[PDB]
Design an enzyme around this catalytic site. Structure first.
Site, PDB file in Angstrom:
ATOM      1  N   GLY A 161      14.994  -0.917  -9.028  1.00  0.00           N
ATOM      2  CA  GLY A 161      13.702  -1.362  -9.500  1.00  0.00           C
ATOM      3  C   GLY A 161      12.697  -0.234  -9.636  1.00  0.00           C
ATOM      4  O   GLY A 161      13.010   0.945  -9.468  1.00  0.00           O
TER       5      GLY A 161
ATOM      6  N   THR B  32      15.938   4.992   5.927  1.00  0.00           N
ATOM      7  CA  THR B  32      16.089   6.369   5.496  1.00  0.00           C
ATOM      8  C   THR B  32      16.593   7.203   6.657  1.00  0.00           C
ATOM      9  O   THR B  32      16.055   7.073   7.761  1.00  0.00           O
ATOM     10  CB  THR B  32      14.725   6.872   5.043  1.00  0.00           C
TER      11      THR B  32
ATOM     12  N   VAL C  81      -3.301   0.026  -4.786  1.00  0.00           N
ATOM     13  CA  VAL C  81      -3.976   0.901  -3.835  1.00  0.00           C
ATOM     14  C   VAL C  81      -4.041   2.282  -4.487  1.00  0.00           C
ATOM     15  O   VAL C  81      -3.018   2.975  -4.548  1.00  0.00           O
ATOM     16  CB  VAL C  81      -3.178   0.942  -2.519  1.00  0.00           C
ATOM     17  N   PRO C  82      -5.202   2.734  -4.972  1.00  0.00           N
ATOM     18  CA  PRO C  82      -5.227   3.904  -5.862  1.00  0.00           C
ATOM     19  C   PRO C  82      -5.171   5.238  -5.135  1.00  0.00           C
ATOM     20  O   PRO C  82      -5.064   6.281  -5.792  1.00  0.00           O
ATOM     21  CB  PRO C  82      -6.574   3.741  -6.582  1.00  0.00           C
ATOM     22  N   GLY C  83      -5.190   5.248  -3.808  1.00  0.00           N
ATOM     23  CA  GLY C  83      -5.195   6.515  -3.110  1.00  0.00           C
ATOM     24  C   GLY C  83      -3.857   7.209  -3.048  1.00  0.00           C
ATOM     25  O   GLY C  83      -3.801   8.368  -2.648  1.00  0.00           O
TER      26      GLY C  83
ATOM     27  N   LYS D  68       8.041   5.122   6.860  1.00  0.00           N
ATOM     28  CA  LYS D  68       8.107   6.517   6.448  1.00  0.00           C
ATOM     29  C   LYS D  68       6.880   6.788   5.582  1.00  0.00           C
ATOM     30  O   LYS D  68       6.239   5.845   5.122  1.00  0.00           O
ATOM     31  CB  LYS D  68       9.393   6.818   5.659  1.00  0.00           C
TER      32      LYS D  68
ATOM     33  N   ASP E 210      11.445   0.116   7.537  1.00  0.00           N
ATOM     34  CA  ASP E 210      11.350   1.156   6.511  1.00  0.00           C
ATOM     35  C   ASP E 210      10.099   2.008   6.692  1.00  0.00           C
ATOM     36  O   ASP E 210       9.505   2.477   5.717  1.00  0.00           O
ATOM     37  CB  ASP E 210      11.425   0.554   5.097  1.00  0.00           C
TER      38      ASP E 210
ATOM     39  N   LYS F  48       6.032  -4.669  -8.739  1.00  0.00           N
ATOM     40  CA  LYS F  48       7.375  -4.232  -8.407  1.00  0.00           C
ATOM     41  C   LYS F  48       8.326  -5.091  -9.225  1.00  0.00           C
ATOM     42  O   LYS F  48       8.243  -6.321  -9.182  1.00  0.00           O
ATOM     43  CB  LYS F  48       7.620  -4.415  -6.905  1.00  0.00           C
TER      44      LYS F  48
ATOM     45  N   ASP G   5       6.292  -2.043   0.611  1.00  0.00           N
ATOM     46  CA  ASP G   5       7.737  -2.000   0.670  1.00  0.00           C
ATOM     47  C   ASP G   5       8.301  -2.735   1.871  1.00  0.00           C
ATOM     48  O   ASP G   5       8.595  -2.149   2.927  1.00  0.00           O
ATOM     49  CB  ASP G   5       8.289  -0.587   0.585  1.00  0.00           C
TER      50      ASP G   5
ATOM     51  N   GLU H 189       0.442   7.641  -2.030  1.00  0.00           N
ATOM     52  CA  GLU H 189       1.274   7.616  -0.832  1.00  0.00           C
ATOM     53  C   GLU H 189       0.765   8.613   0.189  1.00  0.00           C
ATOM     54  O   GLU H 189       0.384   9.750  -0.153  1.00  0.00           O
ATOM     55  CB  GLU H 189       2.711   8.021  -1.201  1.00  0.00           C
TER      56      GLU H 189
ATOM     57  N   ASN I 149       6.018   5.014   2.249  1.00  0.00           N
ATOM     58  CA  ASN I 149       5.757   3.586   2.224  1.00  0.00           C
ATOM     59  C   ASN I 149       4.381   3.224   2.736  1.00  0.00           C
ATOM     60  O   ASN I 149       4.067   2.033   2.888  1.00  0.00           O
ATOM     61  CB  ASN I 149       6.828   2.837   3.001  1.00  0.00           C
TER      62      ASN I 149
HETATM   63  O1  LIG Z   1       3.925   4.478  -5.672  1.00  0.00           O
HETATM   64  S1  LIG Z   1       4.977   3.580  -5.219  1.00  0.00           S
HETATM   65  O2  LIG Z   1       6.133   3.372  -6.084  1.00  0.00           O
HETATM   66  N1  LIG Z   1       5.571   4.292  -3.815  1.00  0.00           N
HETATM   67  C1  LIG Z   1       6.568   3.687  -2.891  1.00  0.00           C
HETATM   68  C2  LIG Z   1       7.939   3.583  -3.559  1.00  0.00           C
HETATM   69  N2  LIG Z   1       8.501   2.297  -3.111  1.00  0.00           N
HETATM   70  C3  LIG Z   1       7.714   1.974  -1.909  1.00  0.00           C
HETATM   71  C4  LIG Z   1       6.298   2.253  -2.402  1.00  0.00           C
HETATM   72  O3  LIG Z   1       6.172   1.321  -3.476  1.00  0.00           O
HETATM   73  C5  LIG Z   1       4.920   1.145  -4.021  1.00  0.00           C
HETATM   74  N3  LIG Z   1       4.338  -0.079  -3.738  1.00  0.00           N
HETATM   75  C6  LIG Z   1       3.094  -0.373  -4.239  1.00  0.00           C
HETATM   76  C7  LIG Z   1       2.437   0.495  -5.021  1.00  0.00           C
HETATM   77  C8  LIG Z   1       3.065   1.764  -5.317  1.00  0.00           C
HETATM   78  C9  LIG Z   1       4.286   2.043  -4.810  1.00  0.00           C
HETATM   79  O1  LIG Z   2     -13.738   2.076  -7.797  1.00  0.00           O
HETATM   80  S1  LIG Z   2     -13.901   1.465  -6.490  1.00  0.00           S
HETATM   81  O2  LIG Z   2     -13.770   2.292  -5.303  1.00  0.00           O
HETATM   82  N1  LIG Z   2     -15.486   0.873  -6.439  1.00  0.00           N
HETATM   83  C1  LIG Z   2     -15.788  -0.145  -7.478  1.00  0.00           C
HETATM   84  C2  LIG Z   2     -17.294  -0.300  -7.721  1.00  0.00           C
HETATM   85  N2  LIG Z   2     -17.597  -1.739  -7.643  1.00  0.00           N
HETATM   86  C3  LIG Z   2     -16.537  -2.366  -6.836  1.00  0.00           C
HETATM   87  C4  LIG Z   2     -15.267  -1.546  -7.101  1.00  0.00           C
HETATM   88  O3  LIG Z   2     -14.499  -1.477  -5.897  1.00  0.00           O
HETATM   89  C5  LIG Z   2     -13.183  -1.121  -6.126  1.00  0.00           C
HETATM   90  N3  LIG Z   2     -12.247  -2.146  -6.060  1.00  0.00           N
HETATM   91  C6  LIG Z   2     -10.909  -1.884  -6.273  1.00  0.00           C
HETATM   92  C7  LIG Z   2     -10.481  -0.641  -6.537  1.00  0.00           C
HETATM   93  C8  LIG Z   2     -11.476   0.413  -6.601  1.00  0.00           C
HETATM   94  C9  LIG Z   2     -12.783   0.144  -6.393  1.00  0.00           C
END
Ligand SMILES: O=S1(=O)N[C@@H]2CNC[C@@H]2Oc2ncccc21
Ligand SMILES: O=S1(=O)N[C@@H]2CNC[C@@H]2Oc2ncccc21
Ligand SMILES: O=S1(=O)N[C@@H]2CNC[C@@H]2Oc2ncccc21
Ligand SMILES: O=S1(=O)N[C@@H]2CNC[C@@H]2Oc2ncccc21
Ligand SMILES: O=S1(=O)N[C@@H]2CNC[C@@H]2Oc2ncccc21
Length: 339
Positions: free
Chosen positions: A44, A190, A112-114, A157, A155, A61, A173, A116, A160
């Site tokens: 996947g 792992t 989650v934009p931050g 690590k 899992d 996913k 994960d 791994e 994840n």
């Molecule tokens: O960026 S990921 O692809 N990194 C890891 C790879 N498999 C476990 C984690 O899966 C994820 N789950 C949610 C968002 C992003 C990801």
């Molecule tokens: O870009 S953010 O950090 N801040 C944004 C500004 N108004 C609320 C929003 O909150 C967020 N929600 C989800 C992801 C990112 C963000």
């Protein structure tokens, strides 16, 4: 503590209600626009998607049913989705939708934009002890929660653990997570993170998660895991040996905690003794940790990832972009009836 007992009792009640009546089929693929592949594996991938009606971003996913069957991951995939739709904890990724089609299974999670933890750890080199401790406390609380529900995670690590917009961990994960009263036997995980009893093909329990926490804390604080080698068999020999070398920069309290988490005898391992998680929470290395403040997300994080907005993918890396094919014919319908 009565507040902890009542909390875990309610947590289990709420988990069991959803566990016994899982949600299914809560969206479909053409409700989303595909943006970018965030990661890829043998059966996947995870893609950033945007929901067309709401504009919200999600991590989707996508599992290929035929590849899940070929790689003998049916049960694990059913575990993953059933557990994710039933759990609720501040440091666990939220499952927002799930559905399946002729070809694939889909789990649509919070994005989650931050990125791994792996990326940040390798970039920074190693985390200071306070920084490692902030993440470790979140894992301790998450495992206390999961284990109280009879769930083993299996899992842990750095790849994840995602870092969120507040700098807190989101565990992703659940591919190997399982509800287990007592022992279980599957070889999975792992190599660097496997407890000796997994390597030795024993019936094992939640103590393997506490071993993995020891490996994680060592890796966060050193920058590399305690047992490594080019061949997995060489990793396994080091794991079972009962020998760990610590960098001289580790504090004495950190070394002591790690000797007790990286305890080869599972009956003597912290987290698996009579006092359970409290042997970890009360250890000197956590003396500065306000457990309630961590749970309530009131501690300022040591690090906030840099990103521009909810759809920013800068903290994830680049993969070949492949089609999401949906066959004209249903594949493996019987195997995934419960999904
Ligand atoms: O960026 S990921 O692809 N990194 C890891 C790879 N498999 C476990 C984690 O899966 C994820 N789950 C949610 C968002 C992003 C990801
Ligand atoms: O870009 S953010 O950090 N801040 C944004 C500004 N108004 C609320 C929003 O909150 C967020 N929600 C989800 C992801 C990112 C963000
Ligand atoms: O193929 S996966 O799904 N599971 C296995 C491997 O890890 C993964 N990492 C990132 C995305 C997908 C996957
Ligand atoms: O950093 S968050 O915006 N996102 C995290 C991902 N879902 C759970 C967490 O939710 C939050 N809860 C309280 C404060 C901040 C945040
Ligand atoms: O391929 S399995 O050996 N994988 C897992 C190992 N223990 C649980 C699962 O058991 C199985 N049950 C039925 C068929 C195959 C398997």
């Amino acid at each position: 503590q009565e507040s902890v007992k009542e909390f875990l009792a309610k947590a289990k009640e709420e988990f069991l209600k959803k566990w016994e009546s899982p949600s299914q089929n809560t969206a479909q693929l053409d409700h989303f626009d595909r943006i970018k592949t965030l990661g890829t594996g043998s059966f996947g991938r995870v893609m950033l998607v945007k929901h067309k009606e709401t504009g919200n971003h999600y991590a989707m996913k996508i599992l290929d049913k035929q590849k899940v069957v070929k790689l003998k991951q049916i049960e694990h995939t059913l575990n993953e989705k059933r557990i994710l739709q039933a759990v609720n904890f501040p440091f666990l990724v939220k499952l927002e939708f799930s559905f399946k089609d002729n070809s694939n299974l889909y789990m649509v999670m919070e994005y989650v934009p931050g990125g791994e933890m792996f990326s940040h750890l390798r970039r920074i080199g190693r985390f200071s002890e306070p920084h490692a401790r902030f993440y470790a406390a979140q894992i301790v609380l998450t495992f206390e929660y999961l284990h109280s529900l009879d769930l083993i995670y299996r899992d842990l690590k750095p790849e994840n653990l995602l870092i969120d917009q507040q700098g807190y961990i989101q565990v992703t994960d659940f591919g190997f997570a399982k509800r287990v009263k007592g022992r279980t036997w599957t070889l999975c995980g792992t190599p660097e993170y496997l407890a000796p009893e997994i390597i030795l093909s024993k019936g094992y329990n939640k103590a393997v998660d506490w071993w993995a926490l020891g490996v994680l804390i060592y890796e966060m604080a050193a920058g590399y895991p305690p047992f490594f080698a080019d061949q997995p068999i060489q990793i396994y020999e080091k794991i079972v040996s009962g020998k760990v070398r610590f960098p001289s920069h580790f504090s004495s309290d950190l070394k002591d905690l790690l000797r007790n988490l990286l305890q080869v005898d599972l009956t003597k391992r912290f987290g698996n003794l009579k006092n359970g998680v409290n042997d970890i929470k009360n250890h000197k290395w956590f003396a500065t940790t306000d457990w309630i403040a961590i749970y309530q997300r009131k501690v300022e994080a040591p690090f906030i990832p840099k990103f521009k907005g909810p759809g920013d993918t800068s903290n994830f890396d680049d993969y070949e972009e492949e089609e999401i094919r949906v066959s004209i014919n249903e594949k493996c319908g019987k195997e995934f009836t419960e999904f």
